[PDB]
Structures are given as C-alpha cells and as structure tokens.
C-alpha cells in the first residue's frame, strides 16, 4: 500500500510571526559515508510556509 | 497496508509568535557511516509552518 | 495493517508564544555506525508549527 | 493489526507561553553502534507545535 | 502503491511575517561519499511559500 | 478638579464568551418627566467590548 | 477642569465571542418630557467593539 | 477645560466573533418632547468596530 | 477648551467576523418634538468599521 | 476651542467579514418636528468602511 495524504489548510490565524536567524560560526563536517537517506524538507537557514516531500526507492550495489 | 493520513487544520489562533535563533559555535562531526536513515522534516536553523514527509524503501548491498 | 491517522486541529488558542534559542558551544560527535534509523521530525535549531513524518522499510546487506 | 490514531485538538487555551533555551557547552559523543532505532519527534534545540511520527520495519543482515 | 496527495490551501491568515537571516561564517565540509539521497525542498538561505518535491528510484552499481 | 482616568487593558484571557438574549415581552413606560440625567453606557439589547462616557453640565430654566 | 482619558488597549485575548439577540415583542413608550440627557454609547439591538462618547452643555429656557 | 482623549488600540486578539440580530416586533413610541440630548454612538440594529462621538452646546429659547 | 482626540488603530486581530440582521416588523413612531440633538454615529441597519462624529452648537428661538 | 482629531489606521487584521441585512417590514413615522439635529454618519441599510462627519451651527428663528 503506503501513502501519506497530508491534508487540511494551515497557517496563522492572524497576528504576527517574527523569525530571526543570527548564528555565528556553525560548522558541519562529514567523512566516509556510503548509505542512503531521505527527507522531504530540510531547513538550513530559515523559512516557513515550506512544503517538501520525498519518495525514494534506490538500489545500491557495492 | 501502511499509511499516515495526517490531517486537520493547524496554526495559531491569533496573537503573536516570535522566534529567535542565536547560537554561537555549534559543531557537528561524523566519520564512517554505512547504514540508512529517513526523516520527513529536519530543522537546522529555524522555521515554522514547515511540512515535510518521507517515504523510503532502499536496498543496499555491500 | 499499520497506520497512524494523526488528526485534529491544533495550535494556540490565542495570546502569545515566544521562543528563544541561545546555545553557546554545543558539539556532536559520531564515529563508526552501521545500522538504521528514522524519525519524522527532528529539531536542531528551533521551530514550531512543524509537521514531519517518516515511513521506512530498508533492507541492508552487509 | 497495529495502529496509533492520535487525535483531538490541542493547544493553549489562551494566555502566554515563553520558552527559553540557553545551554552553554553540551557535548554528545558516540562510538561503535550497529543496531536500529526510531522516534517520531526529537527535540534538539527548541520548539513546539511540533508533530512527528515514525514507522519503521528495517531488515539488517550483518 | 505509494503516493503523497499533499493538499489544501495554506498560508497566513493575515497580519505580518518578518524573516531575517544574518549568519556570519557557517562552513560545510564533505569528503568521500558514495550513496544516494533525496529531499523535495531544501532551504540553504531563506525563503517561504516554497514548494518542492522529489521522486527518485536510481540504480547504482559500483 | 474632576476627572476619571479609567485605564488599563482589559478583556478575556482566552477561552470563550457566549451571550444570549431571548426576552419575550418587556415593556417600558414613562409619563411626565422634567429633570436631567446622564450615563456613559446603556445596554438595551446586548453587547460587549462597549465603551461609553458622558460629561454633562446643562442648565435648565423652567 | 473635567476630563476622561479613557485609555489602554482592550479586547479578547483570543478564543471566541458569540452574541445572539432574539427578543420577541419589546415595547417602549414615552409621553411628556422636557429635560435634558446624555450618554456616549447606547445599545438598542446588538454590538461590540463600540466606542462612543458624549460631551454636552445645553442651555434650555422654557 | 473638558476633554476626552479616548485612546489606544482595540479589537479582537484573534479567533472569532459572531453577531446575530433576530428581533420580531419591537415598537418604539414617543409623544411630546421639548428638551435636548446627545450620544456619540447609538446602535439600533447591529454593528461593531463602530466609533462615534458627540459634542454639543445648543441654546434653546422657548 | 473642549476636544476629543480619539486615537489609535483598531480592528480585528484576525480570524472572522460574521454579522447578521434579520428583524421582522420593527416600528418607530414620533409625534410633536421641538428640541435639539446630536450623535456622531447612528446604526439603523447594520455595519462596522463605521466612524462618525458630531459637533453642534445651534441656537433656536421659538 | 473645539476639535475632534480622530486618527490612526483602522481595519481588519485579516480573515473575513460577512455582513447580511434581511429586514422584512420596518416602518418609520414622524409628525410635527421643529428643532435641530446632526450626525456625522448614519446607517440605514448596510455598510462599512464608512467615514462621515458633521459640523453644524444653525440659527433658527421661529
């Protein structure tokens, strides 16, 4: 089967939304990876009213 | 079967929402990974009204 | 079977919501991992009104 | 069978919600792991009105 | 089967939305990767009212 | 001197307010009046979040 | 002097306000009046978020 | 002097406001009046977000 | 002096406002009046976001 | 002096405003009047975002 019927309206009723991003020196390192991954929505910096999705069925031979 | 019918409206009734992100020196390291993973929504920096999803069925031979 | 019909509206009745994130020097390390994992929503920095999901059925040979 | 029909509306009746995160030097280390895990919602930094989920049935040969 | 009928209208009821991104020296490094990945929407800098998607079924021989 | 600095914010913290007015046959009669009167706010039917005032200094000769 | 500095913000924190007016046969009669009167806000039927005022200094000779 | 500096913002924090007016046979009668009157805001039928005022200094000889 | 500096912004934070007027047979009668009156805003039928005013200084000889 | 500096912006934060007027047989009668009156804004039928004013200083001899 499988399925994700995400549904309905969404949002702010009214009023205000204030988003600030002020990081100084973030660091990300990686070394030696050989797997698989997925994510519909990834937030690095900032945002909203962001809709993502993912659907993945990879085959890896190694 | 499987399924995730996430549904209904959502949000703030009204009023205000104030979000601040001020990290100084976060660090993430990784080394030597060979598995699999998934997540519909990942928040690094900041956000809201963010909708993600994931659906994954990988095959890894190694 | 399996299934997760998360449903209904949700939010703040009204009034205010104030979220502050001010970490100084968090550090995360990892080394040598070979399994599998999943999570629909992961919060690193900050957020709200965040909806995620995950559905995963990987096969790993090693 | 299996199933988790989490449902109903939820939130704050009104009034206010104030969330502060000010950790100084948290550290997380890991070394040598080869199992499996899942969690629908994981909070690192901060948040709310966060809805996650997980559904996982991996097969690992090793 | 598989499918993700994300649907319904979404947005801000009214009022305001203010988004600021002021990172100083973020750094991302990577070295030696040979797997597969997908994500419908990825936010580096900033944005909103962003809709992405992904659908992927790669075969990798190695 | 004289003065009425009515002040401060007021209202419902949140939650609900339900007001019903269902009178059947109210009757008001008057006959032969020759004086003076004042009231800042008068509620006949129904209401709320009603702010009135009065300030009066009439001279009547008769 | 005299003065009425009514001030401050006012309203409903959030949530709901439901006002119903269903009178059947109200009757008001008057006969023979020769005075003076004032009121900043008068509610006959229904309302809210109604702000009135009055300021009156009539001279009547008769 | 005299003065009425009514001030400040006002309204509904959010949520809803539902106003119904369903009177059947109201009747108002008057006969023989010779005075003076004032009111900044008068609500017959229905309304809201109604702001009125009055300022009156009539001279009547009779 | 005299003065009415009504000021500040006003309105609905967000959400909804629903106003219904369904009177059946209201009747208003008057007979024989010889005075003076004022009101900045008068609501017969229905309305909102209505701003009126009045300023009056008549002289009547009779 | 005298003066009414009504000021500031006003309106609906967002969301909706629905106004219905459905009276059946209202009747207004008048007979024999010889005075004076003023009102900046009068609502018979329906409306909104209506701004009126009045300023009057008549002299009547009779």
Author numbering:
A (entry chain C), B (entry chain E), C (entry chain G), D (entry chain I), E (entry chain A), F (entry chain J), ...: 80 to 141
From the paper:
Prion protein (PrP) aggregation and formation of PrP amyloid (APrP) are central events in the pathogenesis of prion diseases. The c.593t > c mutation in the prion protein gene (PRNP) results in a phenylalanine to serine amino acid substitution at PrP residue 198 (F198S) and causes the most severe amyloidosis among GSS variants.
We report that in GSS (F198S) APrP filaments are composed of dimeric, trimeric and tetrameric left-handed protofilaments with their protomers sharing a common protein fold. APrP deposits in GSS (F198S) are composed of N- and C-terminally truncated fragments of PrP, formed through proteolytic cleavage of the precursor protein. The sequence of the APrP forming peptides does not include the F198S mutation, glycans or the glycosylphosphatidylinositol (GPI)-anchor.
